[PDB]
Enzyme design. Structure first.
Site, PDB file in Angstrom:
ATOM      1  N   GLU A  20       3.897  -3.270  -8.794  1.00 39.09           N
ATOM      2  CA  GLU A  20       3.038  -2.336  -8.273  1.00 39.09           C
ATOM      3  C   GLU A  20       1.845  -2.958  -7.580  1.00 39.09           C
ATOM      4  O   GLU A  20       1.054  -3.575  -8.418  1.00 39.09           O
ATOM      5  CB  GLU A  20       2.790  -1.139  -9.179  1.00 39.09           C
ATOM      6  CG  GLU A  20       2.234   0.176  -8.392  1.00 39.09           C
ATOM      7  CD  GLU A  20       0.874   0.034  -7.861  1.00 39.09           C
ATOM      8  OE1 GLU A  20       0.052  -0.527  -8.483  1.00 39.09           O
ATOM      9  OE2 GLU A  20       0.902   0.501  -6.600  1.00 39.09           O
ATOM     10  N   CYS A  67      -1.613   5.662 -10.138  1.00 44.74           N
ATOM     11  CA  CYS A  67      -0.466   4.822  -9.956  1.00 44.74           C
ATOM     12  C   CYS A  67       0.655   5.879  -9.842  1.00 44.74           C
ATOM     13  O   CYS A  67       0.906   6.578 -10.947  1.00 44.74           O
ATOM     14  CB  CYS A  67      -0.367   3.873 -10.909  1.00 44.74           C
ATOM     15  SG  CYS A  67       0.760   2.464 -10.703  1.00 44.74           S
ATOM     16  N   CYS A  70       3.912   4.191 -13.225  1.00 43.29           N
ATOM     17  CA  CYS A  70       3.369   5.069 -14.418  1.00 43.29           C
ATOM     18  C   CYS A  70       2.881   6.182 -14.112  1.00 43.29           C
ATOM     19  O   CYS A  70       1.766   6.514 -14.448  1.00 43.29           O
ATOM     20  CB  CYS A  70       2.527   3.896 -15.297  1.00 43.29           C
ATOM     21  SG  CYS A  70       0.970   3.391 -14.555  1.00 43.29           S
ATOM     22  N   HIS A  74      -1.346   8.748 -16.608  1.00 48.44           N
ATOM     23  CA  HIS A  74      -2.698   8.906 -16.504  1.00 48.44           C
ATOM     24  C   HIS A  74      -3.343  10.439 -16.579  1.00 48.44           C
ATOM     25  O   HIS A  74      -4.321  10.847 -17.024  1.00 48.44           O
ATOM     26  CB  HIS A  74      -3.517   8.451 -14.888  1.00 48.44           C
ATOM     27  CG  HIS A  74      -3.242   6.885 -14.955  1.00 48.44           C
ATOM     28  ND1 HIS A  74      -4.508   6.149 -15.515  1.00 48.44           N
ATOM     29  CD2 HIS A  74      -2.530   6.093 -14.389  1.00 48.44           C
ATOM     30  CE1 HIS A  74      -4.006   4.772 -15.440  1.00 48.44           C
ATOM     31  NE2 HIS A  74      -2.903   4.865 -14.707  1.00 48.44           N
ATOM     32  N   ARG A 471       2.850   0.027 -19.850  1.00 47.02           N
ATOM     33  CA  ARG A 471       2.140  -1.488 -19.791  1.00 47.02           C
ATOM     34  C   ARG A 471       1.252  -1.841 -20.866  1.00 47.02           C
ATOM     35  O   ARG A 471       0.720  -2.926 -20.842  1.00 47.02           O
ATOM     36  CB  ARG A 471       1.584  -1.765 -18.189  1.00 47.02           C
ATOM     37  CG  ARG A 471       2.741  -1.951 -17.358  1.00 47.02           C
ATOM     38  CD  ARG A 471       2.472  -1.546 -15.945  1.00 47.02           C
ATOM     39  NE  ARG A 471       3.748  -1.609 -15.082  1.00 47.02           N
ATOM     40  CZ  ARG A 471       4.683  -0.397 -15.182  1.00 47.02           C
ATOM     41  NH1 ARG A 471       4.215   0.608 -15.672  1.00 47.02           N
ATOM     42  NH2 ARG A 471       5.575  -0.726 -14.248  1.00 47.02           N
ATOM     43  N   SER A 494      -3.106  -2.619 -17.348  1.00 49.62           N
ATOM     44  CA  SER A 494      -3.138  -3.907 -16.110  1.00 49.62           C
ATOM     45  C   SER A 494      -4.554  -4.459 -16.084  1.00 49.62           C
ATOM     46  O   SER A 494      -4.754  -5.566 -15.606  1.00 49.62           O
ATOM     47  CB  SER A 494      -2.317  -3.781 -14.867  1.00 49.62           C
ATOM     48  OG  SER A 494      -1.179  -3.679 -15.101  1.00 49.62           O
ATOM     49  N   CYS A 538       0.459  -4.049 -12.531  1.00 55.67           N
ATOM     50  CA  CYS A 538       0.212  -2.730 -11.578  1.00 55.67           C
ATOM     51  C   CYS A 538      -1.249  -2.680 -11.394  1.00 55.67           C
ATOM     52  O   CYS A 538      -2.223  -2.532 -12.293  1.00 55.67           O
ATOM     53  CB  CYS A 538       0.283  -1.518 -12.573  1.00 55.67           C
ATOM     54  SG  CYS A 538       1.912  -0.832 -12.813  1.00 55.67           S
ATOM     55  N   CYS A 541      -3.135   0.696 -10.545  1.00 55.35           N
ATOM     56  CA  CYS A 541      -3.397   1.074 -12.074  1.00 55.35           C
ATOM     57  C   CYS A 541      -4.773   0.061 -12.557  1.00 55.35           C
ATOM     58  O   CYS A 541      -5.631   0.959 -12.892  1.00 55.35           O
ATOM     59  CB  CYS A 541      -2.455   0.732 -13.222  1.00 55.35           C
ATOM     60  SG  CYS A 541      -1.415   2.167 -13.678  1.00 55.35           S
TER      61      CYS A 541
HETATM   62  N1  FCO Z   1       2.071   1.533 -17.636  1.00 58.76           N
HETATM   63  C1  FCO Z   1       1.092   1.498 -16.829  1.00 58.76           C
HETATM   64 FE1  FCO Z   1      -0.193   1.616 -15.332  1.00 58.76          FE
HETATM   65  C2  FCO Z   1      -0.806   0.143 -15.742  1.00 58.76           C
HETATM   66  N2  FCO Z   1      -1.292  -0.916 -15.933  1.00 58.76           N
HETATM   67  C3  FCO Z   1      -0.988   2.710 -16.619  1.00 58.76           C
HETATM   68  O1  FCO Z   1      -1.775   3.343 -17.437  1.00 58.76           O
HETATM   69 NI    NI Z   2       2.508   2.542 -13.138  1.00 58.58          NI
END
Ligand code: FCO
Ligand code: NI
Ligand code: SF4
Ligand code: SF4
Ligand code: F3S
Ligand SMILES: [Mg+2]
Ligand SMILES: [Mg+2]
Lengths: 544, 262
Positions: A20, A67, A70, A74, A471, A494, A538, A541
């Protein structure tokens, strides 16, 4: 031996595909091995800036768009963060529903990552055309549970579809693949390539089912819409028929995890055992997930069934408790104004300042999160080491199964192979818990369908929302003033893994992991992709 | 072998949730679409090639003798000469401009490419713009955050087979965006009878009363959500939560605060 060229010089890979977001990797290679590395995130959006002055209730809707892979996580972290700030303890049903949605997300996310993002680094799809489907079925029969998807007839059908596509001359997403014409770093027999390709296709269908399960509780996927300050809105998600459908779809997905994902992972791992010695890091962090008590971030850290903790220097004998006060973010090597180093996220600053492409002094839109000065790997490998170290019985059992099947010591898990294996390990464990968690919520909901607690917006407060997303360790941190957002800071897994160097010039986990990577063919540097993809990057993210 | 029409898909300032929505399609599933119906010739999320090999794939598709259609995901960050959003060392605005020049048609998947999206929300630090604004060309908009795969795949199949669908004032195909969310909402008889939930914990909320008093933007949002559902199973109001207005231009600023009508 592991194939390795004699190449000395720079390699840049931009775009890194099958992640991503927008990542540029730069490496220096000497005598066929990476000697130095830079992780350069290439897009900024600035959600933290956008959030300022807004209604704290709105935060989760904006942060969810950090994102879409995922998705959910969030909105969950922001809801937990506002809950902490207004000092509301969510009802038991809302803790259960939120955690189940997280479980569903792990299953979707990991399955898509292994098949659709990662597998093309290890599987030569065109070599599947050389396989004998009778031999493939035989092999599949020995390495995995019996299933009609693995029959010679089914594998020949896949091969014929693939052949017609390749023969059309329009290779689509396989255009200029690193494996075309063969590649010394691709080790699998054609039969294994065929089995994996057949499953890649099946996984495209299965992920639809995984998302549908998630949507029963979440409202829709991507971008769920069922969380509110103080709990959840989805009363229908506590009822009989929806939960029966949720269980049925989750069982189908879990059957695929156990019949295809884990056996494919182990088969691939078995051929790439040399990757057990490449791509290791040393420090691991998790905030934990699947808590029995989510009334406070302290209780989350303490009661997470995938436990929280900190490992330093690979020392599984000492798992430390997470100190939330010890987290900060540096900007020294990032595209932000100088002055912003060493900020705890409640004091976080987001002041963008670009310089130029490949500036070795400022080369990424990610901040550099550090923990008392150390870089921390987060994600499935972190969670696995922490759980294994603490003797979590599911992780002990599954890890030992993997180690036994591969005939490698646990120390071989500090590697790209281990990082890939850990993602599968924890997917199997989520699957093993699904029915228990569903039955628990079905019963709790029948008892009393309370799903949202009463709460009041304070004039001034602060709060932190913790989660372990697919992640890794995710935290959202809010300051409220005049009943509005005064500061809102995301520190995302990330960011931990793929951020740039910190203030002391110390490489991030991905930058360290890349040191020592052999490069068989500098024109087609699949080995860089293997390690980068193992972190499941990601960038949307990580930068937000 | 019958030639399949070429589709080039670009990712700009996006969260990838539009790509994720697209692969939730079931009529047809994504494998059937890309094996039988289209030739998906550039797609960063799922393509095998990386780095210069991927950039070459892009340039080969743009120079294809049969031409190509362009799908754009994400808005365009324009501050500092476009340098805050780059791929292969080129500003996203420059690459999108180049890809758009020869395109047989341009489909904007999502509110960000259609209208600017979350990064354009005040105070818009990256000076983000929607594709039509940035390029000065008409686009076929498939908005929503993300849109339903039904709407996006339907639009794509329509463009390839039938022609360009009739669009509304905001560029949205009337096939999918012709009706208000609210006009098809199962809670409409509650709305009509002034039966509103005052809070999420209330008995009214438990009985499935209308969510207008809790900020529902259904009455001002054009989309097909209640008619078609998401993931064959649900939609936000069915899950007890107000509509955010996510298919409307600049909804981040026009539809907030999300839990109120003011
Ligand atoms: N899993 C995921 Fe996205 C990332 N890095 C988030 O929080
Ligand atoms: Ni994600
Ligand atoms: S429209 Fe929404 S889901 Fe699609 S790229 Fe933009 S923020 Fe993500
Ligand atoms: S819940 Fe929203 S869309 Fe449904 S009737 Fe009420 S205001 Fe309209
Ligand atoms: S928030 Fe969006 S997904 Fe449909 S219900 Fe409202 S237009
Ligand atoms: Mg080629
Ligand atoms: Mg941040």
């Amino acid at each position: 031996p592991t194939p390795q060229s004699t190449f000395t010089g720079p390699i840049v890979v931009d775009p890194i595909t099958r992640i991503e977001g927008h990542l540029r990797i730069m490496v220096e290679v000497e005598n066929g091995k990476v000697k130095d590395a830079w992780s350069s995130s290439q897009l900024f959006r600035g959600l933290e800036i956008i959030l300022k002055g807004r209604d704290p209730r709105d935060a989760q809707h904006f942060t969810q768009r950090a994102c879409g892979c995922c998705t959910y996580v969030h909105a969950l972290a922001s809801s937990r963060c506002v809950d902490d700030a207004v000092k509301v303890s969510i009802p038991a049903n809302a803790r259960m529903m939120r955690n189940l949605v997280m479980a569903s997300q792990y299953l979707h996310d990991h399955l898509v990552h292994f098949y659709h993002l990662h597998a093309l680094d290890w599987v030569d799809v065109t070599a599947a055309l050389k396989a004998d489907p009778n031999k493939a079925a035989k092999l599949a029969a020995s390495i995995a549970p019996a299933r009609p998807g693995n029959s010679a007839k089914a594998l020949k059908a896949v091969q014929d579809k693939l052949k017609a596509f390749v023969e059309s001359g329009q290779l689509g997403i396989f255009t200029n693949a690193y494996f075309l014409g063969g590649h010394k770093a691709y080790y699998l027999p054609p039969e294994v390539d065929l089995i994996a390709t057949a499953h890649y296709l099946e996984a495209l269908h299965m992920q639809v089912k995984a998302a549908s399960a998630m949507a029963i509780l979440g409202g829709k996927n991507p971008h769920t819409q069922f969380t509110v300050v103080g709990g959840c809105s989805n009363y229908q998600g506590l009822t009989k028929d929806p939960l029966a459908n949720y269980l049925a779809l989750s069982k189908e997905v879990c059957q695929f995890v156990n019949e295809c994902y884990i056996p494919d992972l182990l088969a691939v791992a078995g051929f790439y055992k040399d990757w057990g010695g490449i791509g290791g890091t040393s420090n691991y962090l998790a905030f934990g997930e699947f808590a029995t008590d989510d009334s406070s971030p302290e209780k989350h850290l303490a009661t997470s069934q995938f436990p929280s903790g900190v490992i330093t220097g690979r020392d599984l004998g000492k798992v430390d408790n997470v100190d939330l006060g010890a987290i900060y973010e540096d900007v020294k090597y990032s595209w932000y104004a100088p002055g912003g180093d060493g900020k705890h996220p409640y004091d976080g600053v987001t002041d963008p300042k670009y310089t130029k492409l490949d500036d070795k002094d400022h080369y990424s839109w990610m901040k550099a999160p550090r923990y008392k000065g150390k870089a921390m790997e987060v994600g499935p490998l972190a969670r696995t080491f922490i759980a294994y170290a603490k003797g979590q019985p599911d992780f002990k059992k599954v890890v030992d199964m993997v180690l036994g099947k591969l005939s490698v010591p646990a120390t071989a898990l500090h590697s790209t192979l281990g990082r890939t294996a850990a993602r599968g390990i924890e997917t199997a464990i989520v699957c093993a818990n699904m029915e228990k968690w569903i039955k628990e919520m079905a019963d709790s909901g029948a008892k009393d369908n309370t799903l949202c607690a009463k709460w009041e917006m304070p004039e001034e407060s602060k709060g932190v929302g913790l989660a372990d997303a697919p992640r890794g360790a995710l935290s959202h941190w809010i300051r409220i003033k005049g009943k509005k957002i005064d500061n809102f800071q995301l520190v995302v897994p990330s960011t931990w893994n793929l951020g740039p160097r910190g203030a002391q010039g110390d490489k991030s986990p991905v930058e360290e992991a890349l040191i020592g990577t052999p490069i068989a063919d500098p024109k087609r540097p699949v080995e860089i992709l293997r390690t980068v993809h193992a972190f499941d990057p990601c960038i949307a993210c990580g930068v937000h | 072998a019958k030639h399949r029409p070429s589709v080039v898909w670009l990712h700009n300032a996006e969260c990838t949730g539009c790509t994720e929505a697209a692969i939730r399609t079931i009529k047809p599933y994504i494998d059937a679409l890309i094996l039988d119906t289209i030739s998906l010739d550039y797609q960063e999320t799922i393509m095998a090639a990386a780095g210069e090999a991927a950039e070459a794939a892009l340039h080969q598709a743009l120079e294809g003798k049969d031409g190509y259609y362009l799908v754009v995901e994400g808005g365009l960050p324009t501050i500092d000469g476009g340098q805050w959003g780059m791929v292969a060392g080129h500003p996203m605005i420059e690459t999108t401009k180049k890809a758009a020049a020869k395109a047989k048609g341009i489909i904007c998947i999502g509110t960000c490419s259609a209208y600017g999206g979350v990064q354009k929300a005040k105070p818009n630090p990256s000076q983000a713009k929607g594709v039509s604004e940035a390029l000065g060309v008409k686009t076929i908009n498939i908005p929503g955050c993300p849109p339903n795969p039904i709407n996006f795949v339907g639009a794509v199949v329509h463009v390839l087979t039938k022609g360009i669908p009739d669009l509304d004032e905001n560029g949205r195909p009337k096939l999918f965006y012709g009706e208000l969310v609210h006009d098809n909402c199962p809670r409409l008889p509650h709305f009509e009878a002034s039966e509103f939930a005052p809070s999420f914990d209330s008995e009214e909320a438990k009985k499935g009363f209308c969510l207008y008093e809790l900020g529902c933007k259904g009455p001002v949002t054009y989309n097909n959500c209640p008619k078609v559902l998401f993931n064959q199973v649900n939609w936000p109001v069915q899950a007890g939560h107000p509509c955010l207005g996510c298919s409307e231009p600049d909804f981040w600023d026009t539809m907030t605060p999300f839990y109120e009508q003011g």
